[PDB]
Amino acid sequence: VLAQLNGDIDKVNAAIDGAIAGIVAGGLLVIGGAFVTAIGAVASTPVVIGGVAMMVAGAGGITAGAIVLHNSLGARQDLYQKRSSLNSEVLIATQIGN
Amino acid sequence: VLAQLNGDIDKVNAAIDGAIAGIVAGGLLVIGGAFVTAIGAVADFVTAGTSTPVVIGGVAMMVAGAGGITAGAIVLHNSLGARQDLYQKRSSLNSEVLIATQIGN
Amino acid sequence: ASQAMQIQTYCNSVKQQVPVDFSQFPNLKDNQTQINQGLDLAKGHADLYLNTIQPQIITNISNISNYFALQNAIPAVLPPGSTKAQWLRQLSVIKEQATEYQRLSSDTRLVIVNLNNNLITDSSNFQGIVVNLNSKVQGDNGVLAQLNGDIDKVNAAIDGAIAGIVAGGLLVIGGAFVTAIGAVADFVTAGTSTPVVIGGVAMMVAGAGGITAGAIVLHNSLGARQDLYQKRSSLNSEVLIATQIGNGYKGLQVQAQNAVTAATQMSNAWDSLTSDLGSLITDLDKGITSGDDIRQLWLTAADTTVKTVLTDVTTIKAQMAGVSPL
Amino acid sequence: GLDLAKGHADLYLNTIQPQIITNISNISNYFALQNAIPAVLPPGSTKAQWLR
Amino acid sequence: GYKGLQVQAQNAVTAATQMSNAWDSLTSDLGSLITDLDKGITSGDDIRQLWLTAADTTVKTVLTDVTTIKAQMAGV
Amino acid sequence: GYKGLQVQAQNAVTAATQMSNAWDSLTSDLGSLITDLDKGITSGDDIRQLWLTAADTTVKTVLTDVTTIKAQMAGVSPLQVPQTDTIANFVARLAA
């Protein structure tokens, strides 16, 4: 079971990674849209419209990423703890066994 | 207590991993954005003022990216310290719990 | 190696240790206080064994040993010379010698109580010093392992930036050239080679673009990585030095455990002497206050018991023999 | 809890162990007395003083 | 190296102190013996045995320990 | 090689320090014989005998000191063969 869990934990680290990328992608789109907006506020408004579309999307990915992250961290911590429990069980049975 | 500490380590490490991600993606957008900006600025004195949409999107990238590099630094200075606090606190706790069990044994 | 050489060995080892300075390692502020406090205490305990306790035990056994080396027998039948009034005085003397020698033994054992407790506290202090250091070390390896992955991920950014700079120069050298063909063809026949000049400069501007940007990004990516592996080689130092110090204190705790066993074994030897003298005192008492065959029975036993005292005395003397080497 | 444990350990080491070593001393003395009888009671000795 | 050598020096003070004191205990005991003798608490004949028992036991340890120490220091 | 040489030098130093100690004992004990012989000479009868008797004991101690030094200083050291490196091992130590 331990060796299988180790792959499982590896596998799930992709979700945590993916959600971090998401958030930063989000954050980037906001820095960008924020800049494109102040731009349009000079000149005329067609671009300001993109700007907010960009910041809205940005925040979407941050809000979605954040939820995807909470979940994926939780499902991982459940695996860690199951693992550490076995690890401790192998350790005890081995010591007692010897 | 153990799950709370484990959860904060998860958060502090996710915060740092994303800080890095910013620095990485950031630099890409900077470089990316400079290629795009050059292409637009030249296709701007070719097409009289047609392609200002792309010069803008180019500069916007570099700005994003740069903010992504500048942010990922703030966060990597204000996290490295807090991560060593949390691990030391966690190892402390494991040790002390074991000592409690040993006393019982 | 005798029981006293065991304890000496610990004493000479502990006395030579040096207070640790962890001032370059804020994570270890507390491990420093605990160590230097533990050590100062152990140093006092070690001095007192060498200055006081060992001398007292040895002195005490010397007195006891001198007396019973002479009085190595109990006259259990009235001896050819004496009368009965002065037989019963001879015996009453010895009874009182051994009553006095009994309390001294008991008071030697109570000193050994203090010594056992002193070694045990030291052994304990060192157990805890080792445990806390291991905590800290285990903490740090958690971090080191995260710092590692963290460094690998930044090496991406640096590789990217280098890739960007090299693609930059290539775009410039190649762009320059295409611009030169385009530009020289328009000069000979204006108009004909317009998308070439245009593409040439696109590439040229883009290139110096990537070069300038790439180098910025590289300067930051190197800075960021350098902070990371200097934080990393501080932990490696912190681990190494917590480990050396720690393995020193594992050693000191084993030297002190050994001494505990030795001092316990002294406790045991003195307990027997005390108890064997008890029997002597009993045998002489009943001996004195009894009649005929009865008197003799007790006094024979007392004699048998004196040989046992002598046994016990050689035991302690073996225990306190010697001057441990370096 | 620990302090009360070390209290129990201390009672063993400083009250019971010495009582056990004392018991052994008492074995030594008891056999000193047992082996002393033939010494005090030569061959032509009576049941009465064997009993005494 | 510097710290360890101040610690080594400190040890040398503590042991010098204990040795100075040992000489003191000797000179004082020898003085009491002199007083006592001078006021008839004991006789040279008393002293004579106490000094004879000493040499065969307690002094033979000091004298033993001397050639043991000279040995250690000489590597023999 | 220079590691092995510094070890040999550190043993040499220990042996030379231990020489120093034994010569210091001979020195100090002879100071004691001198002290006894003097006080004995300039003294008379029972006190003479006292000093002189110690002097005797000391002279016994002095021979100890001498037999100890003589022990440090006897012997001719045998040849030491350091097994050194061959070609097949050196060519092999490059390949790794």
Residue numbers in the entry:
A (entry chain D): 159 to 201, 209 to 263
B (entry chain I): 159 to 263
C (entry chain F): 17 to 342
D (entry chain I): 54 to 105
E (entry chain G): 264 to 339
F (entry chain J): 264 to 359
The study reports:
We show that the orthologue identified in A. hydrophila (AhlABC) is a haemolytic tripartite α-PFT, requiring all three components for maximal lysis, and we present the structures of the soluble forms of monomeric AhlB and tetrameric AhlC and the decameric pore form of AhlB. AhlC provides the initial single leaflet insertion, assembly with AhlB then producing an oligomeric hydrophobic pore, and finally recruitment of AhlA produces a hydrophilic fully active AhlABC pore. Structural and sequence analysis suggests this method of pore assembly may well occur throughout the tripartite α-PFT family.
The structure of AhlB was determined to 2.9 Å in space group C2 (Form 1), using Se-Methionine SAD and subsequently the resolution was extended to 2.5 Å, using data from a crystal in space group C2221 (Form 2). The decameric AhlB pore is constructed from five dimers of the Type1 and Type 2 conformations, with the Type 1 conformation an intermediate on the soluble to pore transition. Major conformational changes have occurred when compared to the soluble structure, which are centred on rotations about two hinges, hinge 1 (K152-L160 and R248-A254) and hinge 2 (L186-G191 and A222-G225). Indeed, the transition to form AhlB Type 2 from AhlB Type I is an extension of the same hinge movement observed between the soluble and type I conformations. The interface between dimers is constructed from α5a of the Type 2 AhlB monomer (residues I350, A251, F353, L357 and L360) packing against α4 of the Type 1 AhlB monomer (residues L256 and I257) and α3 in AhlB Type 2 (residues V146 and V147) of the neighbouring dimer. However, if a pore is made using the AhlB type 2 conformation alone with AhlC, no steric clashes occur, further indicating that the AhlB Type 2 conformation is likely to be that of the active pore structure. Unlike in ClyA where the α3 and α4 head inserts into just one leaflet, the equivalent hydrophobic head region of AhlB is of sufficient length to cross both membrane leaflets, indicating that AhlB may be the pore forming component of the system.
